[PDB]
Design a protein around this ligand. Structure first.
Ligand SMILES: [Mn+2]
Ligand SMILES: [Mn+2]
Ligand SMILES: [Mn+2]
Ligand SMILES: [Mn+2]
Ligand SMILES: [Mn+2]
Lengths: 98, 100
């Protein structure tokens, strides 16, 4: 009841947006339940939060063909990948919060 | 000549501070040359940068016993680890950056 995730499926990746409701401590990273996704497809991760929340999640999806992290100015930046894209490639995404 | 790294060794982790000087594009992640460290020891990562820089570096040390990311309010938060600490544990380190 303190952290919501939205998941959106795409031809080429699963998007994960997280929202923080109540303020959080890091212990949360032991409790939190990470959305399960299509492994055959890479992952983009967005949300306003501490870098640690982002990194934690990012590593969590490290088996997928790639992981990218959202930056309002740029899109999703691939930070690691096994199969499809390269570190530093930028997927063209915009995320609107109403 | 756009991104500097400092390394500081400790009994229990290698600290990596990174600094950005020129503004950066994400292409940089293909070039960046990461400080090599004692694998037997975990790693703490401090620096101001985009999430992506943090995550990128963090993942880069993913073999070490753990990786933690510095947060001025809290300390170094373990975000992944193989051997020593737990995700969400907070190493109780203070980092102050002396300006000028
Ligand atoms: Mn794990
Ligand atoms: Mn890997
Ligand atoms: Mn790699
Ligand atoms: Mn691993
Ligand atoms: Mn754990």
């Amino acid at each position: 009841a303190s952290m919501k995730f939205a998941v959106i499926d795409r031809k080429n990746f699963t998007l994960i947006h997280f929202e923080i409701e109540k303020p959080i401590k890091p212990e949360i990273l032991k409790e939190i339940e990470i959305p399960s996704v299509d492994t055959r497809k890479g992952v983009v991760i967005s949300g306003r939060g501490p870098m640690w929340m982002h990194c934690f999640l990012a590593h969590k999806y490290h088996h997928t063909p790639f992981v990218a992290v959202y930056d309002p100015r740029l899109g999703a930046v691939v930070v690691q990948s096994h199969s499809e894209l390269r570190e530093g490639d930028v997927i063209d995404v915009v995320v609107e919060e109403i």
